[PDB]
Scaffold this active site. Structure first.
Site, PDB file in Angstrom:
ATOM      1  N   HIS A   1      -8.012   4.771 -68.379  1.00  0.00           N
ATOM      2  CA  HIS A   1      -8.115   5.985 -69.184  1.00  0.00           C
ATOM      3  C   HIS A   1      -7.827   5.669 -70.649  1.00  0.00           C
ATOM      4  CE1 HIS A   1      -7.404   7.724 -65.100  1.00  0.00           C
ATOM      5  NE2 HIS A   1      -6.961   6.469 -64.971  1.00  0.00           N
TER       6      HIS A   1
ATOM      7  N   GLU B   1      -6.725   7.404 -72.821  1.00  0.00           N
ATOM      8  CA  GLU B   1      -5.428   7.955 -73.183  1.00  0.00           C
ATOM      9  C   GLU B   1      -4.340   6.902 -73.005  1.00  0.00           C
ATOM     10  OE1 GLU B   1      -8.082   9.141 -71.258  1.00  0.00           O
ATOM     11  OE2 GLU B   1      -7.060  10.740 -70.241  1.00  0.00           O
TER      12      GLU B   1
ATOM     13  N   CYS C   1      -6.863  14.362 -67.596  1.00  0.00           N
ATOM     14  CA  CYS C   1      -6.966  14.281 -66.145  1.00  0.00           C
ATOM     15  C   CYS C   1      -5.763  14.950 -65.492  1.00  0.00           C
ATOM     16  CB  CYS C   1      -7.044  12.820 -65.696  1.00  0.00           C
ATOM     17  SG  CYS C   1      -7.237  11.748 -67.142  1.00  0.00           S
TER      18      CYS C   1
ATOM     19  N   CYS D   1      -2.136  10.938 -67.133  1.00  0.00           N
ATOM     20  CA  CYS D   1      -2.317  10.582 -68.536  1.00  0.00           C
ATOM     21  C   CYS D   1      -1.377  11.368 -69.446  1.00  0.00           C
ATOM     22  CB  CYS D   1      -3.765  10.830 -68.959  1.00  0.00           C
ATOM     23  SG  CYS D   1      -4.758   9.359 -68.602  1.00  0.00           S
TER      24      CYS D   1
HETATM   25 ZN   LIG Z   1      -6.044   9.819 -66.753  1.00  0.00          ZN
END
Ligand SMILES: [Zn+2]
EC number: 3.5.4.38
Length: 197
Positions: free
Chosen positions: A68, A70, A99, A104
Site C-alpha cells: 500500500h 500509504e 483500506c 493503513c
Molecule cells: Zn492498506
C-alpha cells in the site's frame, strides 16, 4: 550530487484515476504525496520533497507482504529529512479511499504522533463501496490530528499541473468532476460524523 524525481506520466495519471465508476480490487491503489514548508507564513510546495507512491515498490526483495502506497510513505518520510524545528505539512492525493485503520490509516495515525512537526492532509477522489469500513478508519484518522476531505475541481488541477507536467496544459478529467464534488461531498462530509449507534 544531484536531485531525483519521477513525475508520473499523464497516460498513467489519468488512467489510474480513470478506473471505473465503482471499485475494482482492494489492491490496486495510487496515492500522491507532497511536502510543504511554511515559509514567510505561507505554505510552499517543495519539488525536492514531492513525489507519488504506488502499491508495490522497493524493499520487495525481502518478500514482504501487503503493498500500500500509504505504508511505503511512512517508510519514505524519514528520507524527507524533516526537522522538529521548522513546520512541514504533507498532502495525500488518492484516487480512492483508505483500506482500513489497523491496516493503513492506523499506521498513519501512529506516525502523525511520532512527528507532530509535520501535519498530514488526506484527499480521496472516490468512495470505496466494496470496502465501507474505511469510514470508521477515517474517523480514527482525523482524530490523529490529520484532516480529510473530498477532491475538488481546482484541487485536481493543482495535482495534475503539479505532479503531471505537460506543456502546462489544463486538466481534463471527464465531465462529472464537479457534479461528483457536490454529490460525494455530501456523502464524505456526512460520513465525517457517523453517530448514533
Ligand atoms: Zn492498506
Amino acid at each position: 550530487m544531484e536531485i531525483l524525481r519521477y513525475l508520473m506520466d499523464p497516460d498513467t495519471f489519468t488512467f489510474n484515476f480513470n478506473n471505473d465508476p465503482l471499485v475494482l480490487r482492494r489492491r490496486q491503489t495510487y496515492l500522491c504525496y507532497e511536502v510543504e514548508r511554511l515559509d514567510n507564513g505561507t505554505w510552499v510546495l517543495m519539488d525536492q520533497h514531492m513525489g507519488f507512491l504506488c502499491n508495490e515498490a522497493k524493499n520487495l526483495l525481502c518478500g514482504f507482504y501487503g503493498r500500500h502506497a500509504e505504508l511505503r510513505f511512512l517508510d519514505l518520510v524519514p528520507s524527507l529529512q524533516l526537522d522538529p524545528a521548522q513546520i512541514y505539512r504533507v498532502t495525500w492525493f488518492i484516487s480512492w479511499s483508505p483500506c482500513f485503520s489497523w491496516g493503513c490509516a492506523g499506521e498513519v495515525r501512529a506516525f502523525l504522533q511520532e512527528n507532530t512537526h509535520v501535519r498530514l492532509r488526506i484527499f480521496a477522489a472516490r468512495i470505496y463501496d466494496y470496502d465501507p469500513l474505511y469510514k470508521e478508519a477515517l474517523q480514527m484518522l482525523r482524530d490523529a490530528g490529520a484532516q480529510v476531505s473530498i477532491m475538488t475541481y481546482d484541487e485536481f488541477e493543482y495535482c495534475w499541473d503539479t505532479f503531471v507536467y505537460r506543456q502546462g496544459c489544463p486538466f481534463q478529467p471527464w465531465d462529472g468532476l464537479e457534479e461528483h464534488s457536490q454529490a460525494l461531498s455530501g456523502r464524505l462530509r456526512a460520513i465525517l460524523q457517523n453517530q448514533g449507534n
